[PDB]
Amino acid sequence: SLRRGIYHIENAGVPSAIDLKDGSSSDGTPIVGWQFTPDTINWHQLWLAEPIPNVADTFTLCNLFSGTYMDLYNGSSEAGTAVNGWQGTAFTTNPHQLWTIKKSSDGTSYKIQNYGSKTFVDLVNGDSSDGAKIAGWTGTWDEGNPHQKWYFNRMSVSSAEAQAAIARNPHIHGTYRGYILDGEYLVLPNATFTQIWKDSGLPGSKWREQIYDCDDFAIAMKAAVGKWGADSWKANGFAIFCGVMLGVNKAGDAAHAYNFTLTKDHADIVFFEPQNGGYLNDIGYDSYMAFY
Amino acid sequence: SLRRGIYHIENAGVPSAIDLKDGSSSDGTPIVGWQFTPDTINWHQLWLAEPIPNVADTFTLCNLFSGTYMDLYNGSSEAGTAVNGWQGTAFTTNPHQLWTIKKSSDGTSYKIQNYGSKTFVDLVNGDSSDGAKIAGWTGTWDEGNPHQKWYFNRMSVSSAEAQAAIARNPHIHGTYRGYILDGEYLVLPNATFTQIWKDSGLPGSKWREQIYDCDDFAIAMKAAVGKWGADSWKANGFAIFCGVMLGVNKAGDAAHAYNFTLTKDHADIVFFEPQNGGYLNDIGYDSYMAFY
Numbered sequence: 001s002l003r004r005g006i007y008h009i010e011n012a013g014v015p016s017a018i019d020l021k022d023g024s025s026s027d028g029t030p031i032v033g034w035q036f037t038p039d040t041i042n043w044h045q046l047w048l049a050e051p052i053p054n055v056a057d058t059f060t061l062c063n064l065f066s067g068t069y070m071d072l073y074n075g076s077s078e079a080g081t082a083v084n085g086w087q088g089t090a091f092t093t094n095p096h097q098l099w100t101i102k103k104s105s106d107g108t109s110y111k112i113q114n115y116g117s118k119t120f121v122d123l124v125n126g127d128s129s130d131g132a133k134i135a136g137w138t139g140t141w142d143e144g145n146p147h148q149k150w151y152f153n154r155m156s157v158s159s160a161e162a163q164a165a166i167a168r169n170p171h172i173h174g175t176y177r178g179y180i181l182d183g184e185y186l187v188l189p190n191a192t193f194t195q196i197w198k199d200s201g202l203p204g205s206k207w208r209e210q211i212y213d214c215d216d217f218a219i220a221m222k223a224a225v226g227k228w229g230a231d232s233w234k235a236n237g238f239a240i241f242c243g244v245m246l247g248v249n250k251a252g253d254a255a256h257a258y259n260f261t262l263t264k265d266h267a268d269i270v271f272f273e274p275q276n277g278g279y280l281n282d283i284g285y286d287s288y289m290a291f292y
Numbered sequence: 293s294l295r296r297g298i299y300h301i302e303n304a305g306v307p308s309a310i311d312l313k314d315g316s317s318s319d320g321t322p323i324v325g326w327q328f329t330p331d332t333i334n335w336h337q338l339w340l341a342e343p344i345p346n347v348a349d350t351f352t353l354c355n356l357f358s359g360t361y362m363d364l365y366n367g368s369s370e371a372g373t374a375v376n377g378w379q380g381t382a383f384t385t386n387p388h389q390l391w392t393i394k395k396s397s398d399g400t401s402y403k404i405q406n407y408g409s410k411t412f413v414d415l416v417n418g419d420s421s422d423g424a425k426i427a428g429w430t431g432t433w434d435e436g437n438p439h440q441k442w443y444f445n446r447m448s449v450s451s452a453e454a455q456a457a458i459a460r461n462p463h464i465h466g467t468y469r470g471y472i473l474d475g476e477y478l479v480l481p482n483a484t485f486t487q488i489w490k491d492s493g494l495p496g497s498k499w500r501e502q503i504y505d506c507d508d509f510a511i512a513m514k515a516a517v518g519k520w521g522a523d524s525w526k527a528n529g530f531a532i533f534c535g536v537m538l539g540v541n542k543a544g545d546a547a548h549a550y551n552f553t554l555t556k557d558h559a560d561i562v563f564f565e566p567q568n569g570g571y572l573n574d575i576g577y578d579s580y581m582a583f584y
């Protein structure tokens with residue numbers, strides 16, 4: 001089954017993602033095919049899949065930016081029926097906004113079926129143009145038709161996945177304790193993580209003994225990523241990944257506070273130095289505490 | 293011995309505090325007697341006492357606001373010699389800026405002796421006027437003269453003192469771990485703690501599932517108090533007290549993130565709810581983790 005989380009949904013035939021046009025919150029905003037840039041935030045192209053309890057493999061799909069839901073217009077089963085953003089709720093009973101999502105016949109891409117109509121999300125004609133129509137269309141679960149096949153490129157980690165990335169790391173102290181704050185996290189590209197650091201004003205901050213030292217930099221960076229999350233996205237039910245760690249050096253006679261993020265493959269953590277914006281695989285300390 | 297820390301230094305005879313006039317960083321800024329308001333930040337009247345290693349009961353006194361040092365003008369032993377703010381360093385060898393501070397004959401107030409001159413800090417004539425001269429003056433360690441007696445009203449806690457206040461509290465979970473970030477903390481009046489909360493913009497923030505929920509409010513409040521410390525004070529070598537706690541309810545089926553501060557007497561903690569600005573002796577959770 002597709003896991004709860006945030007997805008960049010990319011057509012299997014052409015490099016077009018499912019895009020809520022101009023990120024508009026208006027009811028009936030077209031959802032279209034649009035080109036995308038890897039290792040960026042694709043602002044109009046992120047979808048929070050929320051599993052419906054007791055209805056197998058069936059989800060709402062909420063646009064992270066707009067906070068509006070992928071909606072089959074009037075739930076029509078006619079081929080070519082508009083797929084739009086529409087106001088709704090994460091556990092709606094409105095079948096216009098319920099989507100059964102299961103693996104295609106290629107075992108890697110998915111098909112997206114409207115729960116009400118039993119028609120499929122279709123990039124009409126496989127058109128690769130920016131703003132190409134996406135519609136509900138007749139189809140089958142088993143057929144090869146790439147118009148109706150969608151890679152769910154996973155952009156978020158569970159707290160369990162983040163816990164596993166930390167536990168893999170070779171710089172964890174024997175006394176380590178980790179404190180988990182949320183359930184599902186958007187993983188940022190380093191380019192975005194860096195931009196939030198810059199926009200916080202931290203690059204201008206001076207180290208001062210106790211009054212603005214390592215712990216102040218690390219906590220300011222976590223607060224800044226928190227603020228950016230709330231200020232940037234209209235959807236609820238996820239957080240932004242940014243960790244704080246306290247570490248101790250090999251000699252056991254010096255400690256340091258810093259941040260950490262996750263690799264592109266979500267398998268490992270990377271240390272971030274909020275005093276200079278560096279990324280490091282080894283920051284010269286082993287973590288004895290994290291909160292994220 | 294006087295402990296390292298931040299002091300409001302109040303004359304034993306009249307209610308005048310040692311005040312760096314207009315908080316000016318200029319060399320030769322007069323240090324004067326001035327009236328004060330209890331349970332406020334007295335912005336020009338806070339002094340960081342830094343013990344000199346291997347010189348018994350002898351300190352620098354750094355004005356928290358200006359970052360300049362209490363200085364006996366040209367180290368003169370003549371009665372009536374000016375006491376001013378002057379540029380210096382926490383462990384200076386300049387005897388103009390070194391002060392032997394020991395209990396008076398009343399066992400409660402201190403006398404402040406210049407290490408070089410062996411003359412005492414004197415509120416000239418016991419004048420209670422705002423802007424009354426303070427000078428180096430002839431005296432003895434044992435005499436009752438209240439012109440030369442000073443209550444060192446302690447405004448800061450050590451990390452040890454903060455650890456003891458938490459451990460007293462009846463709402464600490466059996467699994468509690470505390471993570472200490474600094475060494476010496478200015479304790480805020482609730483009136484100031486509240487003002488920093490207001491000035492952060494947190495009173496306007498909405499609770500949103502995961503994306504701005506309890507942990508975001510608590511960490512935003514700690515970041516805001518950190519920022520306020522660095523932006524407000526020019527001295528180094530202390531921090532501002534503001535804790536984050538994670539707690540669990542009695543049933544063990546709900547958790548919450550919040551802040552805590554310290555009572556006026558520095559003996560106990562008080563919980564702060566950053567979602568509404570409330571202070572509570574019981575927030576309905578027992579802490580399993582703190583960082584401060």
Ligand SMILES: C[C@@H]1O[C@@H](O[C@@H]2[C@@H](O[C@H]3O[C@H](CO)[C@H](O)[C@H](O)[C@H]3O)[C@@H](O)[C@@H](CO)O[C@@H]2O)[C@@H](O)[C@H](O)[C@@H]1O
Nearest residue numbers: 027071072073074075086087088089092094095096097
């Ligand atoms: C059958 C129909 O279902 C609901 O209407 C839907 C629309 O529903 C969604 O938007 C409306 C406001 O337009 C409302 O907020 C509702 O809670 C939300 O789920 C929407 O799916 C459109 C576009 O496909 O179709 C229908 O108009 C309901 O509001 C109607 O009363 C009616 O029962």
Ligand SMILES: C[C@@H]1O[C@@H](O[C@@H]2[C@@H](O[C@H]3O[C@H](CO)[C@H](O)[C@H](O)[C@H]3O)[C@@H](O)[C@@H](CO)O[C@@H]2O)[C@@H](O)[C@H](O)[C@@H]1O
Nearest residue numbers: 079122123124125126127137138139140143145147148
């Ligand atoms: C290239 C083309 O692929 C297939 O046609 C698709 C359409 O496919 C879907 O709809 C048709 C009926 O219109 C049928 O129900 C099929 O099972 C279903 O997958 C559809 O994707 C449209 C809109 O994008 O494009 C093409 O017409 C195939 O059926 C055709 O023979 C042809 O090979």
Ligand SMILES: C[C@@H]1O[C@@H](O[C@@H]2[C@@H](O[C@H]3O[C@H](CO)[C@H](O)[C@H](O)[C@H]3O)[C@@H](O)[C@@H](CO)O[C@@H]2O)[C@@H](O)[C@H](O)[C@@H]1O
Nearest residue numbers: 319363364365366367378379380381384386387388389
């Ligand atoms: C004996 C004298 O000591 C120092 O001068 C002090 C002053 O010292 C302080 O301020 C000066 C700059 O004016 C400098 O920054 C120094 O490091 C600092 O400790 C000051 O205490 C004044 C007022 O009482 O008296 C003397 O001028 C030193 O700089 C001189 O060279 C000289 O050795």
Ligand SMILES: C[C@@H]1O[C@@H](O[C@@H]2[C@@H](O[C@H]3O[C@H](CO)[C@H](O)[C@H](O)[C@H]3O)[C@@H](O)[C@@H](CO)O[C@@H]2O)[C@@H](O)[C@H](O)[C@@H]1O
Nearest residue numbers: 371414415416417418419429430431432435437439440
């Ligand atoms: C009321 C007054 O108190 C004392 O005099 C103080 C001064 O006291 C200090 O200086 C004198 C010499 O001027 C002497 O060395 C004394 O031991 C020392 O404490 C001084 O505080 C000034 C400036 O504020 O005010 C008074 O003159 C006492 O000696 C007087 O007899 C008289 O009772």
Ligand SMILES: C[C@@H]1O[C@@H](O[C@@H]2[C@@H](O[C@H]3O[C@H](CO)[C@H](O)[C@H](O)[C@H]3O)[C@@H](O)[C@@H](CO)O[C@H]2O)[C@@H](O)[C@H](O)[C@@H]1O
Nearest residue numbers: 019020021022023034035036037040041042043044045
């Ligand atoms: C917020 C906005 O994002 C970008 O524009 C979007 C656009 O973004 C996608 O397509 C562009 C090329 O047009 C790039 O491939 C991006 O990497 C994609 O994410 C689309 O989402 C359309 C349709 O909804 O809306 C635009 O606003 C960017 O070009 C803008 O400067 C701006 O940052």
Ligand SMILES: C[C@@H]1O[C@@H](O[C@@H]2[C@@H](O[C@H]3O[C@H](CO)[C@H](O)[C@H](O)[C@H]3O)[C@@H](O)[C@@H](CO)O[C@H]2O)[C@@H](O)[C@H](O)[C@@H]1O
Nearest residue numbers: 311312313314315326327328329332333334335336337
């Ligand atoms: C920063 C400034 O603080 C206050 O003025 C100070 C003044 O403060 C003390 O004296 C006033 C009465 O003049 C009150 O008792 C305060 O509680 C004291 O802290 C002195 O420090 C003088 C001399 O250095 O400087 C003034 O700036 C306050 O009145 C101002 O509004 C302002 O907040």
Ligand SMILES: [Ca+2]
Nearest residue numbers: 181182505507
């Ligand atoms: Ca949370």
Ligand SMILES: [Ca+2]
Nearest residue numbers: 210213474531
């Ligand atoms: Ca600090």
Ligand SMILES: [Ca+2]
Nearest residue numbers: 213215473474
């Ligand atoms: Ca520190």
Ligand SMILES: [Ca+2]
Nearest residue numbers: 182239502505
């Ligand atoms: Ca959160």
Ligand SMILES: [Mn+2]
Nearest residue numbers: 170171285286
């Ligand atoms: Mn290591």
Ligand SMILES: [Mn+2]
Nearest residue numbers: 462463577578
């Ligand atoms: Mn309790």
Ligand code: NA
Nearest residue numbers: 052055056057
């Ligand atoms: Na389900």
Ligand code: NA
Nearest residue numbers: 344347348349
């Ligand atoms: Na000493």
